[PDB]
């Protein structure tokens, strides 16, 4: 009877339920994973996500075919219940997922696809711009980093020169310092690139081995090394000029030092110092040799030290006994001096420092207001 005509409706309703239910959770799983949150720190990580999205976009025509194939069964159900006018609820007793539900959910999947590729293309652009910053840093750090190392070595070499001239060493150091002052222009520009990288949240640079802190430390080291070594030259000149020896005579001593140097690293000494004594003066080499062997070092013969020990025996300086005698001739040969006397001869500016800092005489030939220049001058020299 009607059990044959109505059986086809049941076999259609079960084919719908068995096709629509798995397709529904595919769309439910696609709607969620399509608008999923991502974070990448490599160009390969965005290239893999864009590849996986192109694979999803590729199967969409096949998914639309199954979408129409599932709605074909749904339409054919409403077709045969209209064709044979059999009163029923027209709501699939097996699938609780209506055809309208699968239609609106497909529209949602359709709208998320253009969003996902525009968000992946935005992050690809971010990753491509970030890689440019990574490369920009490695371009300067791998050039500035080793440059600093070279100026460090150049300065370390100029502060260990055998052919020492001091005035030539100062002009060479003033040009190594001038190279540093015109290279800072590149380091402050590198600091700007480092800021652009760390502000882009980038801790990734395989293109370089040098960190910014490696350059920051190296630059401070170089800056404190040029300032240190320039002062060394100024100190050697200030002590040489105070020693009284002339500039040409100093270079002459450095030249005589250089040839009597077979050791090179150290000063050629022992019988070579005897060969310096034979050039000038006569004999006196038995007590003078023994004194130079004791004068090698007071505590634990040196190259620079040899130059200092030759210029040490020639000693002539101005001390306290010279100024105490000069204060006595001021006081007209008195063991004390008056405040009135100090301002009578000395310039008023320099006279007032004495009348204030000079102590009480209190000696054998005592007198009120008598200043003691013997204790004032002997304190100035320790």
């Amino acid at each position: 009877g009607s059990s044959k005509l109505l059986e086809t409706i049941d076999q259609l309703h079960l084919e719908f339920a068995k096709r629509a239910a798995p397709f529904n959770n595919w769309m439910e799983g696609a709607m969620e994973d399509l608008q999923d949150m991502f974070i990448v720190h490599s160009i390969e990580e965005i290239q893999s996500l864009i590849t996986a999205h192109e694979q999803f976009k590729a199967t969409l025509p096949e998914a639309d075919g199954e979408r129409q194939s599932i709605m074909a069964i749904q339409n054919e159900v409403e077709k045969v219940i209209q064709s044979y006018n059999i009163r029923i609820s027209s709501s699939n007793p097996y699938s609780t997922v209506t055809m309208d539900e699968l239609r609106t959910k497909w529209d949602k999947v359709k709208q998320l696809v253009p969003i996902r590729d525009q968000s992946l293309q935005e992050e690809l652009a971010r990753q491509h711009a970030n890689e440019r910053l990574r490369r920009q840093f490695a371009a300067q750090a791998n050039a500035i980093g080793p440059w600093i190392q070279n100026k460090m070595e150049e300065i370390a070499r100029s502060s260990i020169q055998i052919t020492g001239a001091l005035e030539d060493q100062m002009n060479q150091l003033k040009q190594y310092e001038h190279n540093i002052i015109n290279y800072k222009n590149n380091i402050d520009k590198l600091e700007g690139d480092h800021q652009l990288i760390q502000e882009a949240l980038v801790f990734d640079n395989k293109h370089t081995n040098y960190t910014m802190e490696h350059i920051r430390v190296g630059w401070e080291l170089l800056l404190t090394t040029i300032a240190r070594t320039i002062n060394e030259v100024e100190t050697q000149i200030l002590t040489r000029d105070a020693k009284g020896i002339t500039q040409e005579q100093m270079n002459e001593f450095r030249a005589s030092f250089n040839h009597f140097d077979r050791r090179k690293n150290g000063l050629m000494d022992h019988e070579d110092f005897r060969a310096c004594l034979i050039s000038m003066g006569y004999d006196l080499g038995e007590a003078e040799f023994a004194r130079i062997m004791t004068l090698v070092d007071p505590n634990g013969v040196t190259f620079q030290s040899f130059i200092d020990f030759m210029t040490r025996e020639t000693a002539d300086t101005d001390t306290a006994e010279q100024v105490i005698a000069s204060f006595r001739i001021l006081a007209s040969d008195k063991p004390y001096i008056l405040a009135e006397e100090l301002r009578r001869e000395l310039p008023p500016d320099q006279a007032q420092y004495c009348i204030k800092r000079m102590p009480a005489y209190s000696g054998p030939g005592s007198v009120p207001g008598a200043l003691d220049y013997a204790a004032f001058s002997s304190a100035l020299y320790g």
């Binding site: 949240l201 800056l223 001869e345 320099q350």
Partner: protein
């Protein structure tokens, strides 16, 4: 003529040094006879201790004292020329005058010569050196060159140019120029008039011993005026040296404490390795550390190696001037300054790296916490939805036909539930990572995840409890 000039000069020279001694002579050939005035004159011009002169009332006493004074002249060693100790007491005019010149030469002419030339050569050289720029002056001998007396006025311009009008003086009046030069010397330089002008200019050759005596007193007067220069240049030397070294010593203490204090406040900040709750706060910490390394440490690096060059030059200036070494304060020492700068640098190397490694770990937590929030809510709604359709126990009113249809509808509610298995697994996995990474809200993420997992278990058992109810209905009508 030589005796008239010796008598006036050697008397007023004796008077110039015997005014101090408290006695005066009038007749040089009579007052010196006893030897008392001669032994007193030697005590003053030398300033040394001399033997005791016997009073000389007796004839033998006078000679005994002249021999005492002449025995003192043997310590100097000066040669004796036609001189007798007896003829001094006798009153020999040529002998006494010649002996006075011996005394003037040894004490007022030999100690004058510093160019190792004895007596006249040392005094003449000084007269020629001091009268070199003067064109109208010519000094070659101590007699005809002194006779004009225009070079004596030039000598007073050589040390006091402000006191004399050199321009007015000419050779037309030798008498008046000599008179004027002796009045200036007597009224200001305290050199009494020993040479008479009228007598010298008339005579063709004046006595060299008398002229040399007058010049020696002029040299002696200007010896202390030029000695003031030695005293001024040495006091200016040691005062400028001690004032500069003391100023530079005060700048070391000033710069050492200023640097020491900046290191004191930037050391705790640099060694605070306690991270913040948000990546925004730590990224802020990185920018203020970036400002420190770009605009705060670089000048303090210059002031550290400026303190080194300043201390270096300070110890050199003291060493080259024989002054003792500079000793800084207990806290502002060399080892204390380098020691504090060493403490500062260790803290700054870790601080960079650490800050990034905190920023990155926060970056992940900030993302995974938001992702979890999003996945938890989309599941919470889905789970609530499926929970209610199972709570509707409307299946008890059904026939075997409706029951078998309801079983295939519940079969779909089972397979679709199993699809959301890895969704719940993902929620549990990303909450586990927030707990392992010490997220600040990992106590409330664990509650939201535990409640979701405890409900998912009940959802699953309730799913299988309703299948068993439908199966109990299908196998009921079957029999």
């Amino acid at each position: 003529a030589w005796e008239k000039q010796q008598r006036k000069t050697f008397t007023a020279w004796c008077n110039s040094h015997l005014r101090k001694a408290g006695t005066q002579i009038e007749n040089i050939e009579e007052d010196f006879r006893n030897g008392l005035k001669l032994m007193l004159l030697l005590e003053v011009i030398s300033g040394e201790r001399l033997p005791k002169p016997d009073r000389g009332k007796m004839r033998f006493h006078k000679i005994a004292n002249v021999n005492k004074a002449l025995d003192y002249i043997a310590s100097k060693g000066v040669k004796l020329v036609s001189i007798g100790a007896e003829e001094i007491v006798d009153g020999n005019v040529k002998m006494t005058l010649g002996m006075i010149w011996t005394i003037i030469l040894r004490f007022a002419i030999q100690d004058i010569s510093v160019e190792e030339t004895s007596a006249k050569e040392g005094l003449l050289l000084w007269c020629q050196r001091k009268t070199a720029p003067y064109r109208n002056v010519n000094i070659q001998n101590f007699h005809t060159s002194w006779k004009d007396g225009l070079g004596l006025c030039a000598l007073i311009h050589r040390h006091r140019p402000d006191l004399i009008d050199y321009s007015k003086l000419n050779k037309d009046d030798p008498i008046g120029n000599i008179n004027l030069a002796m009045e200036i010397a007597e009224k200001h330089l305290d050199i009494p008039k020993m040479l008479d002008a009228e007598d010298i200019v008339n005579t063709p050759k004046p006595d060299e011993r008398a002229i040399m005596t007058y010049v020696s007193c002029f040299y002696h007067a200007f010896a202390g005026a030029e000695q003031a220069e030695t005293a001024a240049n040495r006091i200016c030397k040691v005062l400028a040296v001690n004032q500069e070294n003391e100023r530079l010593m005060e700048e070391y203490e000033r710069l050492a404490s200023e640097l020491l204090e900046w290191i004191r406040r930037t050391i705790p900040w640099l060694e605070n390795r306690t991270p913040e709750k948000t990546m925004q706060a730590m990224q802020k910490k990185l920018e203020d550390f970036r400002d420190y390394r770009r605009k705060h440490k670089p000048p303090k690096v210059q002031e550290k190696c400026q303190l080194e060059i300043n201390f270096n030059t300070l110890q050199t200036k003291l060493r080259i001037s024989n002054r003792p070494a500079f000793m800084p304060s207990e806290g502002k020492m060399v080892s204390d300054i380098a020691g504090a700068w060493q403490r500062l640098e260790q803290a700054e190397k870790g601080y960079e790296e650490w800050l990034l490694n905190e920023i990155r770990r926060l970056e992940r937590l900030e993302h995974l916490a938001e992702k979890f929030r999003q996945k938890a809510s989309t599941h919470e709604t889905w789970a609530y939805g499926k929970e209610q359709i199972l709570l509707q126990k409307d299946y008890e009113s059904a026939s075997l036909t409706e029951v078998r249809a309801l079983l295939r509808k519940h079969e779909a509610f089972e397979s679709d539930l199993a699809a959301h298995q890895d969704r719940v697994e993902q929620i549990a996995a990303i909450a586990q990572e927030l707990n392992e990474l010490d997220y600040h809200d990992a106590v409330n993420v664990n509650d939201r995840c535990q409640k979701i997992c405890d409900q998912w278990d009940r959802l699953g058992t309730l799913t299988q409890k309703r299948r068993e109810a439908l199966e109990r209905m299908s196998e009921r009508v079957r029999n």
